[PDB]
Amino acid sequence: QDQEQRILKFLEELGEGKATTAHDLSGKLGTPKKEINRVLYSLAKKGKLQKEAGTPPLWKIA
Amino acid sequence: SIYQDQEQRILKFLEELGEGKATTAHDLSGKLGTPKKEINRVLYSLAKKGKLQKEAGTPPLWKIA
DNA sequence: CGTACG
DNA sequence: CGTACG
């Protein structure tokens, strides 16, 4: 769970209104974008995050 | 070169398969014992270079063109 | 579930 | 280039 909480903690420390990219999260958290994404898409299905469609997608606390 | 070996192993498996016949990167991966990802890398490469023909689908089919 | 992508 | 994929 280390990552899930870690990602939310970051998105919480960066304004509930401001989004962000997985790549962004990766470079800031020192973690593989692939793992970042699985974590992100999961939180999104759980409805914990808000995925903003597009290329690339944008993530922000729900 | 390992990369070229795998390229050749792919070309040989499809030449033996039969020019008009095709198969998935999955079968290719299981038969040559190489992760499906790498197979796809060589496959799209060889396709780019016209040596192989991709038959769109889910999943795609590959054959010697 | 297609994914090839580095 | 969107890729999360076991």
- On whether the CB atoms of residues B50 and B65 are closer than 8 A, the answer is yes
Asked if the peptide bond before residue B59 counts as cis, ω within 30 degrees of 0, the response is: yes
* Chain B 4..63 CB hits on strand C (< 7 A): 24-26, 36-37, 40-41, 44-45, 58-60
Considering the segment(s) B1-65 as one domain, its CATH architecture is Orthogonal Bundle (1.10)
Experimental method: X-ray
Distance (Å) from CA B19 to C1' D2? 34
CA dihedral of B55, B56, B59, B64, whole degrees rounded to 10: 20
- On whether the CB atoms of residues B38 and B56 are closer than 8 A, the answer is no
Instruction: Find, among A45, A44, A49, the residue nearest to A61 by Cα.
Output: A49
- On whether the CB atoms of residues B25 and B60 are closer than 8 A, the answer is yes
A55 in contact with nucleic chain D (CB within 7 A): yes
Fold classification of A1-62 is Arc Repressor Mutant, subunit A (1.10.10)
Task: List residues in chain A that are followed by a break over 2.5 Å (C to N).
Answer: none
A33 in contact with nucleic chain D (CB within 7 A): yes
- On whether the CB atoms of residues A10 and A25 are closer than 8 A, the answer is yes
Q: What is the resolution of this structure in A?
A: 2.5
Supply φ then ψ for residue A27, to 5 degrees.
-65, -25
- In sequence order, the 6+-apart residues with CB closer than 8 A to the CB of A34 are none
Domain ranges of chain A: 1-62
Distance (Å) from CA A38 to C1' D5? 9
Sign of CA dihedral B5, B6, B10, B11: negative
Separation between Cα atoms, residue A51 and residue A20, nearest integer Å: 10
The protein footprint on chain D, as nucleotides within 7 A of a CB, is 1-5
- Count CB-CB contacts under 10 A for residue A5: 10
Separation between Cα atoms, residue B46 and residue A40, nearest integer Å: 34
- On whether the CB atoms of residues A9 and A3 are closer than 8 A, the answer is no
- Check residue B58 and report its DSSP letter: S
- Count CB-CB contacts under 10 A for residue B58: 5
Q: Tell me the helices (H) and strands (E) count for chain A, helix number first.
A: 3, 2
